[PDB]
From a paper:
Toxigenic Vibrio cholerae causes disease by producing the primary virulence factors cholera toxin (CT) and the toxin coregulated pilus (TCP). Most AraC/XylS-family members, including ToxT and AraC, contain an N-terminal regulatory/dimerization domain and a C-terminal DNA-binding domain. We present here the crystal structures of the V. cholerae master virulence activator ToxT in both the UFA-bound and apo states. We have presented here the results of structural and functional studies of ToxT that reveal the detailed molecular basis for the regulation of virulence in V. cholerae by the UFA components of bile or synthetic ToxT inhibitors.
Crystals of ToxTENV256 K231A were produced in the same crystallization condition as wild-type ToxTENV256 and belonged to the same space group with a single monomer in each asymmetric unit. However, a subset of crystals was found to have slightly different unit cell dimensions. The first subset of ToxTENV256 K231A crystals, with the same unit cell dimensions as wild-type ToxTENV256, contained a UFA within the binding pocket, as obvious positive density in the shape of a UFA can be seen. Remarkably, no such density is seen in the structure of ToxTENV256 K231A solved using diffraction data from the second subset of crystals, leading to the conclusion that this subset of crystals contained apo ToxTENV256. Comparison of the apo ToxTENV256 structure with the structure of UFA-bound ToxTENV256 revealed conformational changes that occur upon the release of UFA. While no conformational differences in the DNA-binding domain are seen between the UFA-bound and apo structures, differences are seen in the regulatory domain. Amino acids Thr138, Gln139, Tyr140, and Ser141, that form part of the loop between helix α2 and helix α3 in the UFA-bound structure, form an additional turn of helix α3 in the apo structure. In addition, residues Leu108, Tyr109, Asn110, Glu111, and Lys112 form a new helix under helix α3, and a new salt-bridge between Arg96 and Glu157 is formed that may stabilize the position of helix α3 in the apo state. In apo ToxTENV256, helix α3 is more parallel with helix α2 and is in better alignment with the structure of the dimerization domain of AraC. The mean B-factor of the α-carbons in the apo-ToxTENV256 structure is 40 Å2 higher than that of the UFA-bound structure. While it is known that homodimerization is required for ToxT to bind DNA and activate the expression of virulence genes, the crystals of apo ToxTENV256 contain only a monomer in each asymmetric unit and there are no lattice contacts that suggest the location of the dimer interface.
Residue numbers in the entry: 2 to 272
Amino acid sequence: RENNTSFLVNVYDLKKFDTYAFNKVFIDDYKIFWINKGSAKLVDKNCLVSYTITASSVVLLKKNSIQRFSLMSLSDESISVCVLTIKNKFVNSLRHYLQGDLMIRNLYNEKKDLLLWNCELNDISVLGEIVSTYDQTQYSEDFLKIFFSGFFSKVEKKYNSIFITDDLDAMEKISCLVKSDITRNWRWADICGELRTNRMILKKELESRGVKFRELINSIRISYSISLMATGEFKIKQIAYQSGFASVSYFSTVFKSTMNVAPSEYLFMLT
């Protein structure tokens, strides 16, 4: 299949009673995921908290976040996890179109990296309906453009929290810097220099997510390698080398230490 634009649709088969563990996976863009049928359990490993998501539940993973969570099937049916990615072009468009200004903002919900909402059952119907049609030339892109223009506007003023921030974030600068030269052997001095800062906002943004400097770079390269596997055709050796890993062994180790699957197994989950 071809690529996409402002919205990335990726559906995965949830093997009944299989655990989907994620250890420090980098979330490059905003992502929401929900199950089409059945039920499942969501376990966040950072905060010792569990959840029971249903077909009416939706989960948000914020951009530039380091996630440590797990998802486990609780249904006899091969559940169909739909993961939708929201790129920056819709983020800047959504942030402007909303002319509202919150008088009291729940800063706890703004600092959290894994939100959970139970949508109106009417919205779940519109959810899987438009997703099953994607995509058309700037035609299906506008169908989800209008849906999330009202869904996010509703949930933001309902919870009195900004869930999709605009730009200007220290993690966005580090991420786009490393991705501008993914194969470069980035060190600490290269990040501080081209960002015109020192280890005050730097180490804190690493300690706030519980990752070393090397751990962050590896997780950025994992998600970059995943975006290459999304095309459909690519040998693991090229994916490892074009993502910045010196050897296929260290790429497979970090990938399995991040996705809890072999890199070839994720290629089978796609096709």
